[PDB]
Amino acid sequence: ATVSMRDMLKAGVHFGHQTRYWNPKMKPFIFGARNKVHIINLEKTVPMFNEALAELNKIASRKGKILFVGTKRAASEAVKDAALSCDQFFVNHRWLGGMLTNWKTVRQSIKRLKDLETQSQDGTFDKLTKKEALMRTRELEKLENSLGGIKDMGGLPDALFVIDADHEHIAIKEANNLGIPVFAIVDTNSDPDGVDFVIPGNDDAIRAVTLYLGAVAATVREGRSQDLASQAEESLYFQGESFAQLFEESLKEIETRIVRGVVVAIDKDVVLVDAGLKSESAIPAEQFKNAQGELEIQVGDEVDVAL
Amino acid sequence: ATVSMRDMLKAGVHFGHQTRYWNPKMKPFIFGARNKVHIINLEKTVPMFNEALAELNKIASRKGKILFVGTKRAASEAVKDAALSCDQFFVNHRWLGGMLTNWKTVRQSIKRLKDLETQSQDGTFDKLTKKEALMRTRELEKLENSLGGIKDMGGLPDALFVIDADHEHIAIKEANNLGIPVFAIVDTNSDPDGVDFVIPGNDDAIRAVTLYLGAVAATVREGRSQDLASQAEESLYFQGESFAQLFEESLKEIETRIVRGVVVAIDKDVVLVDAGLKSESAIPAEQFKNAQGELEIQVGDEVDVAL
Ligand SMILES: [Zn+2]
Ligand SMILES: [Zn+2]
Prior knowledge:
Entry title: Crystal structure of E.coli ribosomal protein S2 in complex with N-terminal domain of S1
Strand content of chain A: 15-25%
Chains A, B: 30S ribosomal protein S2,Ribosomal protein S1
Assembly: dimeric
Oligomer: homodimer
PDB class: ribosomal protein
Keywords: ribosomal protein, complex, translation
CATH architecture of the largest domain in chain A: 3-Layer(aba) Sandwich
Bound molecules: zinc ion
Distance between the termini of chain A: 51 Å
Structural class of chain A: alpha/beta
């Protein structure tokens, strides 16, 4: 996975802040200045982004959970779009101190959110006074704005992808403390020190932000599915055996002896065994019950069967 | 997209029916017979499946809708799994004559399904007698079993993918009449004539059926997203220009003159214009209102702006 330099140039990825606003720590990523404005060196952005994408692909491929964080105007709606498009998670309105470091508390706040969700729907709020119903409605607003993108995360994320390292410094510091790797777009006015995988680039243009998140969402989908990887395993070696050769070889795989197999499905009075024939074999449960009339085997168990 | 011959052999794709059950029309796809059973020639299955996958990829890439059809025991639950995994549609319980050819009627039956959905939830059924409520409950059962996988299809499909051509002959004939292309697994006991893209193979093993649907769902996801295609466009040509060359070239793209731009977002009193700077420009709506105080422009419109 990569984005080309020409694509980044068109999106404005190389536009830094005015030089008077810079953080000197971004010097290695700066190409120069034109008209009192810093130009970001895409010669560095491209390999550093590829490096970031490769590791996010690896994390996603072990069922890793990715938290997209971006709450500034330019990032907010796109962060949600990206996260949804690859079945991950997000914070896009505002960060509450402790979302990560006090995660056991957040977990309870999530159940409280779901209870308030139910209450607002099943008429509980209508049986309250206006003053009370408003209290619960504002609480539900706070919880949904802040936790709505993570309510099904189910534990700490395995990585953070962040738009604007300075704007999101609180979250980045929590991740640091927990040893959660941080991938971030770092603009010329920002401190890169807390960022594990820095991506030098413009964090102020919707089109630039969209370019980054798109490449991220794609590589995360590829990590989960293994679509393109499993496919490009057919070119790694010779596969030109004839069917005839392969079929005759498979006939000699028969030794010796009645057959052996594996349960794949147990619906009452129907036990299903894959013994590698044309069809799986559906067996009456009775052959698999003990003296008390209970099922002895489980889906995935190994068994025997009579040809 | 492809499945290897070794993968098909392991899944049992080559196991045909007993020869006494064959349809002579399947002769070109048959390798031979062992123990009074027909062996399917995978030398033919592999290129014919690749051919089918390539055209399904093309159909999906123009936002085509794919209807997965499989109602026999071995196909039923996997057909649903596959369809869901690539955001398409399915029929997996039983085919009602006219689902395709009388589609304008099906459309009304879909709204009737949604109304019954609401009624069963909002307590309408509880206000009925038992005899009446049972009538509506059975109607809801019929509609959900048959239309549940297509209720958001929104029109005729652009292709059918079918498990077992003989078992699903009714649907295949409706598609024929409507000119909708049929992709189907055709076993040695079946008639291939109605099938546009026949895939000679075992249609009785869950593991074989799973192998086919998996490859289909992947190629459909790839058609929609263009993940792997857009990525493998970076290898088609030289991309070794230095950033310096590219940046200096982009500086000469400035001619002449105040700037020109494109609206991207209109939220009351905030009009957003992309003029290719570091940030999009947010302009007060007032500059864009006519004498009556109405908005003159729309999202996507072209405008002008003062630097
Ligand atoms: Zn910035
Ligand atoms: Zn069959």
